[PDB]
Amino acid sequence: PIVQNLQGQMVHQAISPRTLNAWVKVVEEKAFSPEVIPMFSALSEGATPQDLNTMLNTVGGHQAAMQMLKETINEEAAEWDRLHPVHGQMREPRGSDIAGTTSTLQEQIGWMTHNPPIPVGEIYKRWIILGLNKIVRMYS
Ligand SMILES: CCc1cc(-c2ccc(C)o2)n(-c2ccc3c(c2)nc(-c2cc(C(=O)O)ccc2O)n3Cc2ccc(=O)[nH]c2)n1
Numbered sequence: 001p002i003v004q005n006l007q008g009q010m011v012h013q014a015i016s017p018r019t020l021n022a023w024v025k026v027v028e029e030k031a032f033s034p035e036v037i038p039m040f041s042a043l044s045e046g047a048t049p050q051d052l053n054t055m056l057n058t059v060g061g062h063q064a065a066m067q068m069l070k071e072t073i074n075e076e077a078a079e080w081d082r083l084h085p086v087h088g089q090m091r092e093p094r095g096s097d098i099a100g101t102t103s104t105l106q107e108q109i110g111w112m113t114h115n116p117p118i119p120v121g122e123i124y125k126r127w128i129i130l131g132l133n134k135i136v137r138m139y140s
């Protein structure tokens with residue numbers, strides 16, 4: 001995630017094992033429950049798209065759930081491209097860039113800290129939450 005240090009600068013730091021552990025814990029302890037969703041938000045504060053993918057991959061053995069998530073992400077990325085088509089320079093992010101599949105961590109941090117910013121982590125996070133809601137329904 002990207003966090004503000006003591007001075008006031010925005011610095012990147014890795015996800016802790018503790019955080020990844022708590023995430024796997026909640027996904028399984030509360031499997032199928034929407035209770036998982038606010039915990040996802042809590043555990044992913046300041047997350048970049050790469051971070052979100054690390055979290056998803058740690059629970060990536062769930063075949064049907066991951067497939068539902070993937071198709072949701074694909075749909076949202078397509079809608080992003082419709083809503084915001086791409087026309088010290090910096091290229092603008094496309095749907096696949098927000099999902100972290102075609103962008104580097106450097107590029108993601110660049111967008112998030114740009115003036116003015118595009119919070120690609122927060123955007124991707126919403127797509128994932130859409131997916132999580134659909135997983136709840138698929139297993140209701
Ligand atoms: C928002 C709530 C949520 C989000 C995710 C979630 C997972 C990954 C991501 C990104 O999100 N899950 C979730 C958690 C555990 C799961 C799961 C989905 N799907 C299975 C599963 C079911 C069957 C199947 O039912 O055929 C066969 C194989 C399976 O991997 N398990 C395992 C399981 C299965 C039964 C049980 O009682 N407990 C746990 N729930």
Ligand SMILES: O=C(O)c1ccc(-c2ccc3c(c2)nc(-c2cn[nH]c2-c2cccc(Cl)c2)n3CCCn2ccnc2)cc1
Pocket residue numbers: 084090091092110111112114115116117118119122123
């Ligand atoms: O759903 C959300 O939460 C959500 C949705 C959309 C946005 C969003 C999308 C595109 C945005 C934006 C903000 N701000 C700008 C914007 C406005 N001026 N410069 C930029 C910019 C240019 C290059 C890289 C980056 Cl990082 C920003 N653009 C680029 C617009 C096109 N452009 C290109 C140059 N000047 C303007 C933010 C949040």
